Enzyme design. Structure first.
Site, PDB file in Angstrom:
ATOM      1  N   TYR A 250       0.890  -1.275  -0.025  1.00  0.00           N
ATOM      2  CA  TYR A 250       0.053   0.058  -0.063  1.00  0.00           C
ATOM      3  C   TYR A 250       0.855   1.230   0.073  1.00  0.00           C
ATOM      4  CZ  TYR A 250      -3.125  -3.591   1.833  1.00  0.00           C
ATOM      5  OH  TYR A 250      -3.722  -4.827   1.822  1.00  0.00           O
ATOM      6  N   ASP A 251       2.056   1.181  -0.529  1.00  0.00           N
ATOM      7  CA  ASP A 251       2.927   2.286  -0.585  1.00  0.00           C
ATOM      8  C   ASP A 251       3.632   2.341  -2.020  1.00  0.00           C
ATOM      9  OD1 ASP A 251       4.167  -0.120   0.415  1.00  0.00           O
ATOM     10  OD2 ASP A 251       5.175   0.442   1.995  1.00  0.00           O
TER      11      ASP A 251
ATOM     12  N   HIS B  25      -4.059  -4.778  -5.254  1.00  0.00           N
ATOM     13  CA  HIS B  25      -4.793  -4.108  -4.359  1.00  0.00           C
ATOM     14  C   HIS B  25      -4.909  -2.438  -4.560  1.00  0.00           C
ATOM     15  CE1 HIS B  25      -5.170  -7.888  -2.484  1.00  0.00           C
ATOM     16  NE2 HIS B  25      -4.293  -7.665  -1.832  1.00  0.00           N
TER      17      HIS B  25
END
Lengths: 1002, 986
Positions: A131-132, A168
Site C-alpha cells: 500500500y505504498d 490492491h
C-alpha cells in the site's frame, strides 16, 4: 569483516560446495531465467516490515481499540483481521476510516538495500502486494522506469513494456478505502470488481518463472493462487520457486507436501544459524548467494573453465571470420581485446577464467585431468581462437608479428574461376547462400535476387538462423540497389548508353515493388526468437545499409583522434614503436569482413572508409621530411614508413578514384615511397588485362557489370606507373591499353598521357615499339575517310604521338607506313596531312613521293608548314620571300601608323620571325632595318638594344617552345630580366612564374 | 477511390486514421474468420453436416439446417460410432491442398502484431513463408511456455495440422459447452490480448456463437473504459440503421462494405479488395482534404519539444522523415514528400494576413507559435524563391562568452524552476570540474519524474554519467604523476565520493535509454537519439563533421583564379560549425577528447583560405566575405587550439595581415580574463580541478596578439598579469620573455609598460639577492633579455630602485649581484663605476657578456688567448670516449667562437690549429669542405646579420648553397625560405 568478501567470499564458496542438488539446480534455473530476460518477481508485504512500515495488525488493533473502547486481549484471530473493519465501516461511517488511514499512512521511510538488491537482477515484470511506493521509489532512484498499474484505465492506457502491478491498488487518487482492497467484501468480489487486473495476473503467471519473496505459508493470496493452479493439467506448467526466511527449521513432511503441490522451496534458515529477529540478515544472505551466482565459476579438474567459454562461443561457430573488437560485446566488456591479439583484464571482477584457459592452452601437460568431452571442447575452442588471431595474454606480450589474408575470390577478381565455380550444381544451403552472394556484383542481379528468395523460402529449418538474417538483409539491400540502379539508368538515358540498356522488364519491377512494400527493417530489434536474440547480439548493427554502419562511427571519430598526433610537421623526432599507422592499417584490414558481406564496395559511403584512411596514411608525410628542415638525427633519407603490400595496391585500385589520386599525388612523393611484392601485382594487372580484353572483344548485356570494372581500370593503370612492371607483361598491358578500351571513355589524349607515364616509368627496349607502330598504322587506315574525326579533351595532336617513338629510337622508320605512302594519290587531303604529321618516321622515298603532293607557294603556306613541321629550316629563297612580305609589312606599318591602330593580334608572325633570327636559324642583316615593328621582335632581333618598357611576363606561358634554356646562357641583360621575375613573384601568386624561377633560373 | 471517398465523411475517414495510427504504433491486431477460407475455397461446414446427416438419418436435408442442428447433429454420431469414422471423414474432407489467396498476402502486408484465427486451416500459416514473417503458433495449452517469439499465431479451436484425431479440435457441442475447462490457458490470454490491443474483425460471422460469448463478456464487465473494437461487415445486401444503431449501443462500431462499392453479389473478392485498399493508404497521403492543415499533422510533430530554445537545422530533416532537405543556410525543398506541400502551405500562409484572418483563433495562436519557433531557429523562406542566407551567429549562454562575476552571483542566488535548477547545475559544472553536490542531478531526476513536463530526466542522466566519466578520468590523471605535477597529494575529491559513485554507477544501462523511456517518449522525442547512446555515436559528433574530409579532398582548385575564401566555403563549413556550437546550450561539453580538437580541424581551412586573394584576381585587394574574425571565432581559437597548433599555423599561413572585428570586445575579454586570473591567484588556492584546463585558455590568449591595439589601462593590466601572477611552472622566465616580446612589438611601448617592466626587474633582483635562488631558463633566455629589450626600444631608461643597491652594496657575494653585473649598461654612472671597480671582466662568460652588451667588441691578445685555452680544454674533453661528452648542446658557445671568425673579430689565425669538433659548425674555417647538410635550414633562418649584406655566400660558397634552400622551399612551406632565396645568398 565488512567491506571484504569474508562472509561473502570463502565461506559462501564452501556453502556452495556443500549445497545439495536441489538448491544448486534452482540457482542455475534462476540465473538462466535472469540472463534470458524471462524473470518476474512477486514481492510480498514481509519486506515492508524491513522498512518499518505500519502493519495491518496494528491497524486492526487500533480499530478494536476505538470500537469497543478496550482492545481484545490475546492474539487476534485471522478472520477478525478482515471482519472488524467491516463492522467498523458499516456503523461508524467512512469519515473515521479515512481519518485513521490518513493518520497511519502519511509518513515516509528510506528504502532498504533489499529493494535495489532485487531490482539489480533485470526483472521483466514485478508483481507486488502493498500500500505504498517503497519499491516504486527504489526503482525510481535507481533509474529504471516502471508503469504503475492499479486500475482498469491503467490497463487500457498501456504505455510501456515493463509492468508494476498493484493487486490492491495504491493511494495516488487519495487516501480512500474504496479504491484500495482492504475489506472482506473486496476479498469476496475481487473477480467482479477487478476483472482486468486478475486476468492479467493469471496470464503473466504462466508466461514466466514466478519467484515468490517475502511471503509466509498460509497467506490468503498464496493459497488462492495454489487453488487456481491445482485446477490445471500441469502437463507443461513450470513450478514456481519460493523463498521463506523462517527462524525455525521446516518440517520435512510440509516440504514433501508443498513439493507435491507444485512449488520448489528454497530455505534461508538452513543456510546458516542466525537470530530470530535477523530477517534482514537472512534476506541479504539469500540475495548475496543469488548475486554471487554470477561470479561463482569455481575451478576444478573437470569444470566450466572450458565449458563456460564453450557455451558462450558455440553459436559463433557458424560465422567464418569475426572481428577481434566484436568479442568485447560477447564477453559483456569483461575484458578489452586489442587488434594486436593481446587481451587485457580491464573492467572485470571475480575469477580470471581467461587466464586459466590460457594456462591450459600453452601448457601441454596438466591437461589430461579434463574429461574427453571437455578435451574435445578445448580442441574446438583452441582452433577457433587460433583462427581469429588471438596470440597470448596481455602480460605475455612481445613478438607481435601478424599478417592479413583474405580467402574470397571476389577480392582477387579471378573472374574465370568465378564463373567456373558459379556453374556447378547446388549441394547444401550454406554453399547456396555463398554462391548467391557470389552471383551478385557480377551483372546478373535478377538471378541473385531469385536465389535469395529461394534461400529465404526454406531457411527456417536452420539450427541457428543467422543465414536467415543475412539473407533477409541481402534481399532488402539488393532491392534498394536495383532501385537506385534503375533510377540512375533513367537519369542517364541515352547519354551514357548508345542504346538504353534496361536491366529487365517492368514485370519484375512490379512484383518486387509488391514484395518489398511496407518493409521496415527491425528483425532482431523487435521480433525474432528470444534464443537467437540472447546470442548473436553482435549482429545487431546489421539492420542498416552496410554491414558496418554503426561500427564505422568509432573509426570516424578515432581517425581524427589519432590525426591529432600522426599529422603534424612540427615534430621531427620520429616515432619509434607503437606506430599508430600500423594499428590503423590493422583496424581497417580487420574491417575486410569479406567472408560474409554484401556489395560493400557498391555502397558509396562505405568506400569512404578506404577513401579516407589511406588518404590520412599518405597525409602522414608530416612525419616524413623531418630532420631535413630540422636538426633532428643524422638520418637524412627521405624514406617514410608505410611499406605497402599487395593488399594496399588492391584497395587503392578498388576504391580510390582518378581525380583523388591526382589530388594526393599533387602533394606527395609516392615515387620515393618503396613497396614490395613486385610479382603478384604484375599478375593482378595482367588478369585485369585479360578481363578487359575478353569483355570488349564481343560486348553483350554486361552493362550492370560495366559500371565498376570500368572504374577499376582507371585506378589500376594510372597508379601502375609507380610500380615497375616486367617487360613480359608490358606487352599485354599495352595491348589492353591501346585496342580494347572503349573509344568514348578514353580519347587519344588521355591514352597518350598514360602511355607516356608507363614508358617513363619502365623502358621499352624492342617489343612494345612494334605494337605502337601497329596502332599508328591502324590510325592511318582510320584516317582513310576524311569525314571521320575524333574529339580530344587536351589535344588532337599526333606530333608528340610518334615523337615519343622517335625519342625511343632515333633511327626509326615505319616500312609499312612507307609503302602505304607510296601507294597513295592526291585525292585524300586529310590522309596527306596525317602523313605530314608522320614525316619524321617516314622513309626518304616516302618523303619524296609525298612532297610532290603539296608545297609552299606563299609565305603563309611556309608558316603553315611550320605549324605541321614540313620545313624545319627554309631556304634563303623563302627567307627573302618573308623579307618581301616583311618589307610589305614595313611600308604598311607607316600606313598603319597613320591609321592610328596596331594590327598585331592576327598574323603574329613577326614574333615568330624574330624567333628564328634569335635562334640563329637565319643569319641576315636585313631584319635589323625592320626594327621597331613589335616588342617581341625588339626583344629577339636586337636583345642588346631593345626597350623592356613593355613589361609583359605573361609571354612566359608560351616560351616552352622558345627554348628558354638556350636563352638562359644568352640573355644580354640577365640582371635586368630577372628583376622582372623578382617583382612578378612578389606581386603575383601564380605558380608558373615560380616554375621559370627554377626550370630556367637559380 | 477518391470519387468514393468524396462521401466518406460519416465516422469512416477518422476510423481509417485511427486504425492506421494503431498499425503505426503496433497495437493493431487482426481477427480473421471463415470468409477468407471460402475465398481460398476451403471445404465448408454445411457439406460436412450434410454428409453426417446422410450417414445416419438418410436422404439429404429436405428442410434447412438450423443454428442448433449445425452443432448437435455430428455429436449424435459420436454417440453411436467410434472415433475412427470421424478420423476417416475428416481425412477425406481435409486431405487437400489449396492455393494461398492474395488476401493472406495483403493481410501479412498490413503487418499486424498478433493474428487470431478461429478457423482450422494452414493457409494463413503457410502464407507467412512467402512474406518471410516469423510467427510462433499456439495450437492449444500444451505449447504456451515454449514462447519462441513475441509474435503470436493463436488457434482458438486448434487445427488439423496435428488434428487427425477428433480430440485435437473442438467442433461438437459437448466441447463447446465446456470449452473453458478443456482450454483454460487460451481464454485468459485471448481476453488480455483483446483488452490490451486494438482488435479488428474481418470476414467474420455476425451471428456466430463465439462473437456472441465475446460480446456477452466485454460489455458485461466493462462499461466506459473499454476501447470499442472495429468490425468489417462484408455482405451483399446494404445494411440499415436500426441494427447498426443497436450494435453501436452494444459497444462495437461497424464499417460496411456496401457503402463503399456494390459491384455484385458473388464478387466477394471485389468487396474485400476494396475494403482493404481503403486501409492500404496507411494514412501517408491525402488523409484529410480540409483547410488549416498547417495546424494539424505538423503541430503535434514540430512543437512537442519547444521547451528547447535551439534546434539544429539538420535535425529537422530527421524530424520530417527526410521529406524535406533542410539546408545549412536555412532553406528547404521537397525530397520524398508525396502529396500536399504542407511546408509550402505554411510558407504561403506566413505572409498573407488576409487568409490568416479566416484561421481559427486557437489555430491562429498555434500558427503564430510555430512561426515564432521557426524564425527563432532560422528558417525564413524556401530554396525555390530565396537567395543568400548569411546571418549573424550569436550565443546567449554566458559560459561561452567568459563572464565569471555574474556567474558567481547567479550561483549564490537560489533557483526554483526545474529548468533553472538545470541551468545552475550546468553552471556549477562549469566552475568546478567535480560538482561538490552532484546530487543536484539527483534532485533534477526526482523533480522531473514528479512533474509531467518530461525530457529532463533523460538529459540529466546523460550529464551525470558524463560527469562520472570525467571525475574518473581526473582520478586517473591524479596518479603518481599528479602528486608531483600539482606539488603534493592534493586529493580534491575525497574517498567517500568515489565509494558512493562507484556503487551508484555500477551496471549502468548505457547501452540504450529508449528502452527505459515509454513508447511516446521514443516516438515524439526520437530527435534525441543522436546523443542518447553517445557510445562514440553518430550524427552528433563526427558524422556530419566527417563531411569536411570531402572538402579537404576538394581543396585542390584548377588554374589560379578560383577561390577557397570568396566561395560557398562559408556554407556547410563555417555556418555548419557555428550551428553545431550549441544544440541546446545545456549539453555537457565537459568531454574534450574529440570536440575541442575537431574545433581546430575547423577554423583551419578558413585560415588557409586567407591567401590575400593574390591569385583570385590580379590585386590582393579583391574588394565579398571580408573575413573579419569576430569575437566568437576568436574565443574558439583561443579555447580549442594548442601552442604547437598556432605555431605550425604561423609557419605557413597568413597571421598578421588578417584583421579581426569586434576589437573592443576582444579588449574586454582579455581584460576580464587577466583580472579574473589575478583575482583567482589570491581568491583561492590551486583549485587544480578548474585550474588545470583553465590556464590553457589563458596561455592561448597571451601568445595570440599583433591583432588588436591594446588600451592603455588594459595593456597595463594585461602586462600586470605577467607581474609574477602567472604560475612560473607553466611559464618560466624564457617563455615570459618570448610572450612579452610578441606582445606590444607592433606598439610603441608607453612609459607605463616601461615602469611595469622595471618593477618586474626589481622583483627578479630581489629574488636573485637571496644568494640561494638560481634563474631557471629552459630555452636559455637569461634575465638580461629584459634589460636588452628595454633601452633598445626607448632612451634614458633609468631607475632608482636598484642603482642605490649597487652603490650601497656590501661587497658580500658576486652570485647575488650577477644580475647587476650583467645589467651594468643600464646601471647609474656612479653605480656602474663602483661596480666596475669592484669586479673586472676576465672569464669567457664575462667576455661574452661584454661583447654582447657594453664594454667593447675588440679585446686584448690575452683574452683571445684565454678563449683559445678554453678551446684546448674542449680538446681535452679526447676523453669523451663516446659517453655523452661528445655532445655539446648543453654548453652552446663553440659556434659563438666561430661567430667571431669571418666577422673580423680576431687578431690571428690560430683557430686553424684547432680542428672544429662541431660537425654542424666547422665550415667557417673550411668553406670548401663541408659535411653533408652541415648547415641546417632551421639555423639558416635563425640569424639575420651574419649574411652581412649577402657577403656570406658572396665571398665564397656562391653555388651549391642555394640548392638546399631551394629544395626546402620546394618541398616544405615557409615564407622565410622564400626571403632567403630573395636575398640569393645564404
Amino acid at each position: 569483516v565488512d567491506l571484504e568478501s569474508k562472509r561473502y567470499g570463502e565461506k559462501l564458496k564452501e556453502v556452495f560446495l556443500m549445497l545439495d542438488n536441489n538448491v544448486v539446480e534452482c540457482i542455475k534455473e534462476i540465473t538462466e531465467s535472469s540472463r534470458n530476460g524471462k524473470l518476474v518477481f512477486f514481492v510480498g508485504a514481509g519486506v515492508s516490515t524491513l522498512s518499518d512500515y505500519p502493519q495491518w495488525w496494528r491497524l486492526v488493533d487500533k480499530y478494536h481499540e476505538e470500537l469497543y473502547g478496550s482492545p481484545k486481549k490475546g492474539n487476534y484471530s485471522s478472520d477478525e483481521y478482515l471482519r472488524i473493519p467491516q463492522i467498523f465501516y458499516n456503523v461508524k461511517g467512512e469519515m473515521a476510516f479515512d481519518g485513521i488511514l490518513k493518520d497511519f499512512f502519511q509518513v515516509d521511510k528510506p528504502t532498504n538495500p533489499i529493494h535495489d538488491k532485487i531490482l539489480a537482477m533485470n526483472p521483466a515484470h514485478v508483481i507486488t502486494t502493498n500500500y505504498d511506493n517503497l519499491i516504486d521509489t527504489a526503482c525510481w532512484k535507481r533509474g529504471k522506469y516502471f508503469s504503475v498499474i492499479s486500475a482498469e484505465e491503467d490497463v487500457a492506457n498501456a504505455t510501456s513494456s515493463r509492468y508494476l502491478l498493484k493487486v490492491h491498488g495504491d493511494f495516488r487518487k487519495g487516501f480512500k478505502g474504496e479504491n484500495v482492497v482492504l475489506k472482506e467484501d473486496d476479498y469476496l468480489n475481487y473477480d467482479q470488481n477487478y476483472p482486468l487486473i486478475s486476468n492479467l495476473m493469471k496470464t503473466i503467471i504462466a508466461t514466466h518463472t514466478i519467484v515468490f519473496i517475502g511471503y509466509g505459508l498460509g497467506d490468503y493470496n498464496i493459497n488462492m493462487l495454489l487453488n487456481w493452479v491445482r485446477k490445471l493439467q500441469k502437463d507443461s506448467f513450470h513450478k514456481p520457486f519460493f523463498i521463506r526466511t523462517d527462524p525455525s527449521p521446516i518440517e520435512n513432511e510440509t516440504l514433501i507436501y508443498y513439493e507435491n503441490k507444485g512449488l520448489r522451496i528454497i530455505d534461508a534458515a538452513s543456510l546458516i544459524d542466525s537470530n530470530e529477529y535477523d530477517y534482514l540478515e537472512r534476506y541479504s544472505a539469500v540475495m548475496d548467494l543469488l548475486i554471487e551466482s554470477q561470479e561463482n565459476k569455481f575451478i576444478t579438474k573437470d569444470d566450466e573453465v572450458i565449458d563456460y567459454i564453450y557455451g558462450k562461443i558455440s553459436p559463433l561457430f557458424a560465422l567464418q571470420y569475426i572481428r577481434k573488437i566484436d568479442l568485447k560485446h560477447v564477453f559483456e566488456y569483461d575484458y578489452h581485446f586489442e587488434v594486436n591479439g593481446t587481451v587485457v583484464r580491464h573492467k572485470n571482477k571475480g575469477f580470471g577464467y581467461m587466464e586459466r584457459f590460457f594456462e591450459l592452452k600453452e601448457s601441454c601437460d596438466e591437461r589430461s585431468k579434463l574429461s574427453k568431452k571437455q578435451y574435445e571442447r578445448f580442441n574446438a575452442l583452441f582452433n577457433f581462437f587460433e583462427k581469429n588471431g588471438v596470440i597470448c595474454m596481455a602480460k605475455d606480450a612481445g613478438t607481435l608479428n601478424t599478417s592479413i589474408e583474405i580467402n574470397s575470390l571476389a577480392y582477387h577478381g579471378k573472374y574465370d574461376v568465378m564463373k567456373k565455380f558459379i556453374e556447378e550444381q547446388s549441394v547444401s544451403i550454406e554453399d547456396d547462400y555463398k554462391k548467391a552472394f557470389f552471383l551478385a556484383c557480377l551483372g546478373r542481379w535478377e538471378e541473385s535476387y531469385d536465389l535469395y528468395s529461394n534461400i529465404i523460402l526454406n531457411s527456417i529449418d536452420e539450427s541457428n538462423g543467422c543465414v536467415y538474417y543475412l539473407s533477409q538483409i541481402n534481399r532488402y539491400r539488393i532491392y534498394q540497389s536495383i532501385t537506385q540502379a534503375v533510377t540512375q539508368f533513367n537519369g542517364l538515358g541515352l547519354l551514357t548508353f548508345g542504346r538504353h540498356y534496361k536491366p529487365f522488364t517492368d514485370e519484375f519491377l512490379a512484383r518486387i515493388e509488391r514484395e518489398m512494400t511496407n518493409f521496415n527493417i527491425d528483425d532482431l530489434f523487435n521480433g525474432m526468437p528470444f534464443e537467437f536474440q540472447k546470442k548473436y547480439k553482435i549482429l545487431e548493427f546489421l539492420s542498416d545499409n552496410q554491414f558496418l554502419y554503426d561500427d564505422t562511427v568509432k573509426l570516424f571519430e578515432l581517425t581524427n583522434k589519432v590525426r591529432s598526433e600522426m599529422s603534424e610537421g612540427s615534430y621531427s623526432f620520429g616515432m619509434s614503436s607503437d606506430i599508430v599507422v600500423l594499428l590503423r592499417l590493422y583496424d581497417n584490414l580487420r574491417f575486410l569482413y569479406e567472408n560474409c558481406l554484401w556489395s560493400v564496395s557498391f555502397h558509396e559511403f562505405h568506400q569512404y572508409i578506404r577513401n579516407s584512411m589511406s588518404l590520412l596514411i599518405e597525409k602522414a608525410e608530416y612525419e616524413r621530411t623531418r630532420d631535413i628542415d630540422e636538426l633532428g638525427f643524422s638520418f637524412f633519407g627521405k624514406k617514410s614508413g608505410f611499406f605497402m603490400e599487395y593488399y594496399d595496391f588492391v584497395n587503392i585500385s578498388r576504391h580510390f578514384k582518378i581525380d583523388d589520386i591526382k589530388n594526393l599525388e599533387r602533394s606527395c612523393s609516392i615515387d620515393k615511397i618503396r613497396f614490395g611484392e613486385q610479382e603478384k601485382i604484375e599478375e593482378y594487372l595482367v588478369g585485369i588485362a585479360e578481363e578487359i580484353t575478353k569483355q570488349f572483344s564481343a560486348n553483350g548485356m554486361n552493362v550492370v557489370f560495366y559500371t565498376q570494372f570500368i572504374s577499376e581500370a582507371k585506378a589500376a593503370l594510372y597508379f601502375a606507373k609507380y610500380v615497375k612492371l616486367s617487360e613480359e607483361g608490358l606487352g599485354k598491358i599495352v595491348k589492353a591499353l591501346l585496342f580494347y578500351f572503349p573509344e568514348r571513355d578514353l580519347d587519344i589524349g588521355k591514352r597518350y598521357v598514360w602511355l607516356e607515364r608507363l614508358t617513363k616509368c619502365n623502358e621499352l627496349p624492342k617489343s612494345i615499339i612494334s605494337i605502337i607502330d601497329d596502332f599508328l598504322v591502324l590510325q592511318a587506315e582510320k584516317h582513310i575517310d576524311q569525314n571521320y574525326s575524333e574529339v580530344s579533351s587536351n589535344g588532337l595532336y599526333s606530333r608528340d604521338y610518334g615523337a615519343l617513338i622517335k625519342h625511343f629510337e632515333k633511327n626509326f622508320i615505319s616500312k609499312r607506313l612507307s609503302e602505304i605512302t607510296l601507294c597513295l594519290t592526291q585525292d585524300k587531303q586529310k590522309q596527306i596531312d596525317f602523313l605530314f604529321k608522320l614525316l619524321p618516321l617516314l622513309s626518304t622515298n616516302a618523303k619524296s613521293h609525298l612532297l610532290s603532293f603539296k608545297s609552299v607557294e606563299n609565305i603563309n603556306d611556309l608558316m603553315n608548314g611550320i605549324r605541321i613541321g614540313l620545313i624545319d629550316e627554309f631556304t634563303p629563297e623563302h627567307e627573302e620571300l618573308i623579307i618581301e612580305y616583311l618589307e610589305t609589312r614595313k611600308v604598311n606599318y607607316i600606313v598603319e601608323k597613320e591609321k592610328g591602330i596596331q594590327t598585331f593580334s592576327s598574323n603574329d608572325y613577326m614574333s615568330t620571325f624574330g624567333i628564328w633570327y634569335f635562334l640563329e636559324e637565319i643569319n641576315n642583316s636585313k631584319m635589323e632595318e625592320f626594327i621597331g615593328m613589335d616588342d617581341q621582335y625588339d626583344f629577339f632581333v636586337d636583345p642588346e638594344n631593345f626597350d623592356y618598357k613593355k613589361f609583359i611576363p605573361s609571354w612566359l606561358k608560351n616560351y616552352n617552345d622558345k627554348l628558354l634554356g638556350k636563352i638562359a646562357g644568352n640573355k644580354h641583360m640577365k640582371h635586368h630580366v630577372i628583376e622582372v621575375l623578382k617583382e612578378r613573384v612578389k606581386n603575383s601568386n601564380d605558380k608558373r612564374y615560380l616554375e621559370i624561377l627554377m626550370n630556367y633560373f637559380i
